[PDB]
Design a protein around this ligand. Sequence first.
Ligand SMILES: O=C(NCCc1ccc(O)cc1)c1ccccn1
Length: 191
Amino acid sequence: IKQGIREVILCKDQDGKIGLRLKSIDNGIFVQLVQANSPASLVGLRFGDQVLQINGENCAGWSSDKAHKVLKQAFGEKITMTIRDRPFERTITMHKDSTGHVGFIFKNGKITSIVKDSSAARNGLLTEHNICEINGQNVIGLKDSQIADILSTSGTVVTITIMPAFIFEHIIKRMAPSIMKSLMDHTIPEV
Ligand SMILES: O=C(NCCc1ccc(O)cc1)c1ccccn1
């Protein structure tokens, strides 16, 4: 989680899509969904990201509807966007024990308890926080099943990106859980 406002430059794909849903939160606009193999993935937009400007205009106070209408009306040879990096999230690094554990339980992405004498415990991992990424890989929508499988195959240093549940539940409302599952970019980044 950088302390960074950065500029990204986008390009509507062949069908006029950039692959992005936006959500009004606290008079800001946030990334609710980055679609896999989209403009928005290639430039490296991330769930939770904040969109400060779109073509040099401020997003402050915009409805979701307007953000989306703004995107459609734009001449997608070049869309500029000014981004604040995942501002509602934090990253925690942890090391697995010899039993491979980091030392928590989660349910529906959400960390529900912490296990005494663990790295989870040593590192002040918190409950009531949804899991957003792991070692930099979006994991929103996947079954708990599949998130366990990522954790097991991670190596010792595991890196988790969390978000307060209340904020998380506020971001994803009005998005059908299957769209999340199939269409949210769960892929490692291209170079
Ligand atoms: O993209 C537009 N609106 C955002 C999508 C939408 C949301 C709600 C609604 O009721 C209808 C459309 C648009 C495009 C041309 C003229 C006006 N609006």
